[PDB]
Amino acid sequence: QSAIDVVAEKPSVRLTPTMMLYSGDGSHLLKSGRYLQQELPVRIAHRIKGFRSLPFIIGCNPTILHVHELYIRAFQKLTDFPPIKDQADEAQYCQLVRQLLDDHKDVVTLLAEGLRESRKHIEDEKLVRYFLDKTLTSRLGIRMLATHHLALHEDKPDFVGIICTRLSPKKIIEKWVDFARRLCEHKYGNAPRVRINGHVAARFPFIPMPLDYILPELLKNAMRATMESHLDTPYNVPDVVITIANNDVDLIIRISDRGGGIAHKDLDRVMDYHFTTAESGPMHGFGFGLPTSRAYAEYLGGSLQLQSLQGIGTDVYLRLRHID
Ligand SMILES: CC[C@H]1CN(Cc2ccc(-c3ccccc3-c3nnn[nH]3)cc2)c2ncccc2O1
Ligand SMILES: CC[C@H]1CN(Cc2ccc(-c3ccccc3-c3nnn[nH]3)cc2)c2ncccc2O1
Ligand SMILES: Nc1ncnc2c1ncn2[C@@H]1O[C@H](COP(=O)(O)OP(=O)(O)O)[C@@H](O)[C@H]1O
DSSP, X not given: OHHHHHHHXXXXXXXXXXXXXXXXXXXXXXXHHHHHHHHHHHHHHHHHHHHHHSOHHHHTSHHHHHHHHHHHHHHHHHHHSOOOOSHHHHHHHHHHHHHHHHHTTTHHHHHHHXXXXXXXXXXXXXXXXXXXXXXXHHHHHHHHHHHHHHHHTSOOXXXXXXXXXXXXXXXXXXXXXXXXXXXXXXXXXXOOOEEEXXXXXXXXXXXXXXXXXXXHHHHHHHHHHHHHTOTTSXXXXXXXXXXXXXXXXXXXXXXXXXXXXXXXXXXXXXXXXXXXXXXXXXXXXXXXXXXXXXXXXXXXXXXXXXXXXXXXXXXXXXXEEOOO
C-alpha cells in the first residue's frame, strides 16, 4: 500500500521523559491525543518496513508473514480513524489503541517461532540479533508511547502517566525478589536469600515498565545459577547480593551471585537470542532474557554488562540513565 510508503521513512517524533513530566489538563490531553494519532501509524509503518526489508526467504515464513499482515491491518485501522477535534474524539481513539495493544501483546512469541523455523536459511548471525533488537525496542517504544497517553487520563498516586515521580529502586527490586523467590522455592524447595545494599533510600522520577521485565529476568538467572551450582547442598546456598548506586547521571543496579559463573565456552553466546543452558511482551525464557534486557537498557540511555568469575559467580550491572 502506498499510504504505508508515505510514512515508512518518516523520522519518529518522541517526547522527552522530562517534557512529559513538565506537562502536569484537558487542553493539553487534546494536544497529546492528536500527537498519538499521528505518531502511532509512523511507528507501525517502521515495523512494516522491517518485514519488507527481511531476506525474502525469511519474510516468506507463514508465521512471519502473518505478523507482517497483522501490522498492515492495524495501520489501516489507525489511519482510518478520523482526526481528533475535541475530548470526545480523543477518548474514542484511546479505546481503539487499547484494543489493538491487547490483541497483539503476544506477537513476540510468534516472531520468535517464525525466526526459529527459518534458522537454516539464516547465514548471517547478526541478522536475527539486529532484527530482534529493533523489534523489541520499537515494540517497547510503541508500548510506552500508547500506554503513557492512556494513563495520563487516570489519577494514580505518584504517577504522571507511566512515569513514577518518586520511584524507589529498593521497593521495585523487593517486589520482584519476592516473586522470584516464591517460584524458585516451588522448583527447588529453596531459594537464595537476597540482600540489598548501597543507596537503599534512593527515590527519583523513573519509568518502572522496563524494570518490570529486566529485574525478574536477572533475578531468575542469579537464583537459578545459584541453585544449579549447589544441588548437592540445596538448603544451604549463598546469598544473591544486590547493590544500588544512585548518582546525578545514572542508576546502577549490580546483581552479584555465587552461581558458578558463565563458562568461557558460552560467554560469546549468552547475548544471542535463543541461547540457553536451562532444561504478553517479550518471553521470560527461551534465551530471550539477556539480549532483551540489554536492548531495553541501551534503548533507555543505559547498558547491561556482565562480569563472569568462572568457578565462583557473576556480577550483572544494569545501568539506566536518569530523567533529570
Ligand atoms: C497499537 C497497534 C499496534 C500495536 N503493535 C505493537 C505492540 C503491541 C502490543 C504491545 C504490548 C502491550 C502490552 C504489553 C506488552 C506489549 C509488548 N511489548 N513488547 N511486545 N509486546 C507492544 C507493542 C502491534 N503489533 C503487531 C501487529 C499490530 C500491532 O498493532
Ligand atoms: C532527550 C532524548 C530522550 C531519548 N531517550 C529515549 C526515550 C524517549 C522517550 C521515552 C518515552 C517515555 C515514556 C513514554 C513514552 C516514551 C516514548 N515516546 N516514544 N517512544 N517512547 C522513552 C525513551 C531517553 N531515554 C532515557 C532517558 C532520556 C532520554 O532522552
Ligand atoms: N547469573 C548467571 N550465572 C550463570 N549463568 C548465567 C547467568 N545469567 C545468565 N547465564 C547463562 O546465560 C544463559 C542465557 O541467559 P538468558 O538470556 O537470560 O536466557 P534463559 O534464562 O532463558 O536461559 C543462561 O541459560 C545461562 O547459561
